[PDB]
């Protein structure tokens with residue numbers, strides 16, 4: 569169907585999304601950039617939807633994190649999330665869709681601004697949240713692999729699916745893990761949806777980018793990069809090691825799987841059959857920029873070979889001296 573402004577879309581309901589598309593590209597994402605706001609909004613899809621336990625409750629991908637923002641933004645594991653919630657609230661006021669829909673929508677638009685990213689399938693028509701999330705449902709960076717895999721499993725994700733979702737950390741930084749160094753990314757390309765994250769998390773640590781005494785932080789391989797202890801454990805754990813390494817220099821797998829599993833996540837606590845497919849509204853992502861590599865100065869013997877089925881792929885290292893990682897511009 570052709571919308572009131574010439575732009576087209578399979579279903580006519582989806583038309584209402586075009587004004588919101590523009591609003592958030594202009595006013596949320598610094599004109600369509602893969603930066604802080606995009607990263608936080610992606611993070612927000614998870615903190616919303618992960619609020620889903622058959623044991624403890626929660627409506628999952630329901631926009632509760634905004635609807636019930638006084639409760640949820642005050643959970644420990646939600647530290648820092650208040651910023652992007654209070655930035656999105658006004659958009660939700662302004663426009664005529666539920667908070668649940670918006671979070672997923674914004675996150676989908678956001679990812680699509682990242683080189684090498686993908687169009688996460690998006691559905692329209694989530695009812696309002698009817699309850700806040702229980703606490704203790706968001707995985708923390710200092711939790712054990714078992715603890716985390718059980719939590720994700722309680723929510724409906726197999727171990728391999730957790731790896732796929734954690735592709736998100738290829739375009740991500742931390743503000744609260746070490747508050748002395750806000751904006752410190754998880755891989756050396758926070759602005760590119762690539763394999764660098766799965767690569768760089770497998771290296772032997774060298775140093776600590778800020779202070780060393782941080783809960784939930786592992787030793788980093790690179791100056792200007794933070795390593796979550798969780799990612800460090802997951803990248804080496806028997807259940808996940810080989811899946812983690814399978815992602816290395818494997819952009820099609822990162823792309824297809826991330827998209828597919830994100831779609832599952834976005835539809836937690838929701839019935840796909842009572843929603844409306846609006847996936848063609850999401851902009852077309854840019855192609856991958858740069859190619860897989862070990863950081864400059866590094867080699868294959870920096871790699872901790874956790875996977876037993878397969879060797880680490882014979883990557884080459886960037887030319888030159890060990891360089892450091894520039895932060896995410898923001899704050």
Ligand code: HEM
Pocket residue numbers: 604607608610611613614648707708709710716730733734736737739740741742743744745746796798
């Ligand atoms: C396996 C369990 C996970 C743990 C323990 C975890 C932990 C964390 C931590 C500690 C941060 C840094 C927050 C800060 O201090 O600013 C972070 C950031 C982030 N998380 Fe994860 N995470 C997990 C899974 C996921 C998943 C499944 C997604 C998918 C949407 C995701 C999306 C993000 C993004 C995009 C950021 C960066 C936000 C920014 O750059 O501002 N995370 N995560």
Ligand SMILES: *[C@@H]1O[C@H](CO)[C@@H](O)[C@H](O)[C@@H]1O[C@H]1O[C@H](CO)[C@@H](O)[C@H](O)[C@@H]1O
Pocket residue numbers: 756757862863864886887888890891892893894
């Ligand atoms: C240091 O530079 C090396 C190449 O010069 C890379 O192998 C390292 O990953 C690291 O690069 C990081 O910083 C540079 C700027 O000097 C960026 O160009 C990279 O994208 C990365 O952020």
Ligand SMILES: *[C@@H]1O[C@H](CO)[C@@H](O)[C@H](O)[C@H]1NC(C)=O
Pocket residue numbers: 664665
């Ligand atoms: C606002 O959006 C809701 C949900 O799509 C819709 O039912 C309602 O009619 C809209 N309000 C108007 C008339 O713009």
Ligand SMILES: *[C@H]1O[C@H](CO)[C@@H](O)[C@H](O)[C@@H]1O
Pocket residue numbers: 810811813814815875877878879
């Ligand atoms: C070794 O493990 C790799 C994953 O890194 C697989 O691609 C391969 O099939 C084998 O099991």
Ligand SMILES: *[C@H]1O[C@H](CO)[C@@H](O)[C@H](O)[C@@H]1O
Pocket residue numbers: 848849850851852853
């Ligand atoms: C992204 O944009 C491309 C063209 O630039 C379309 O082919 C696609 O449908 C999506 O909207």
Ligand SMILES: *[C@H]1O[C@H](CO)[C@@H](O)[C@H](O)[C@@H]1O
Pocket residue numbers: 791792891892893894895
């Ligand atoms: C490495 O050092 C560069 C400058 O030399 C910083 O910009 C970056 O934050 C990292 O610490």
Ligand SMILES: [Ca+2]
Pocket residue numbers: 615616617618619627628629630631632633701
């Ligand atoms: Ca929720």
Ligand SMILES: [Ca+2]
Pocket residue numbers: 738739755756757758759760761762763764765
């Ligand atoms: Ca990256």
Ligand SMILES: [Mn+2]
Pocket residue numbers: 604607608741742743
């Ligand atoms: Mn942040």
